[PDB]
């Protein structure tokens, strides 16, 4: 059903209330421009419970701080020290993301498929 509908590609604002716990996701990128992408969403974590983030999403900013051209560690530092309420502006970029994970590609609906 849903899985055949196109994944929205416009930027989205996601407000996560995580208090003093991890956001519950992994980031890759931050080397030479690339950008910061979500590579994994932890089951049960705040990011998962938000139901608004997914692997392949690029983190454009955290609490107003532009992360488009952030380095890996600084981006991590920004997220970890973002505070209890984290406002992320994210944008689905599967083609860009697919470059990181082995044997991964994008299907007609924009879904990241790994072979």
């Amino acid at each position: 059903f849903l899985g055949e509908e196109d994944i929205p590609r416009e930027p989205r604002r996601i407000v996560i209330h995580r208090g003093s716990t991890g956001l519950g996701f992994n980031i890759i990128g931050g080397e030479d421009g690339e950008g910061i992408f979500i590579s994994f969403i932890l089951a049960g974590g705040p990011a998962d419970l938000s139901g608004e983030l997914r692997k392949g999403d690029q983190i454009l900013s955290v609490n107003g701080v532009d992360l488009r051209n952030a380095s890996h560690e600084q981006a991590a530092i920004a997220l970890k020290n973002a505070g209890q309420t984290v406002t992320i502006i994210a944008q689905y970029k599967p083609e860009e993301y697919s470059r990181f994970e082995a044997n991964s590609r994008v299907n007609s609906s924009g879904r990241i498929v790994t072979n």
Binding site: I28, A76, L79
Partner: peptide, 5 residues
Amino acid sequence: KQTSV
């Protein structure tokens, strides 16, 4: 690099 946050 990959970091869990």
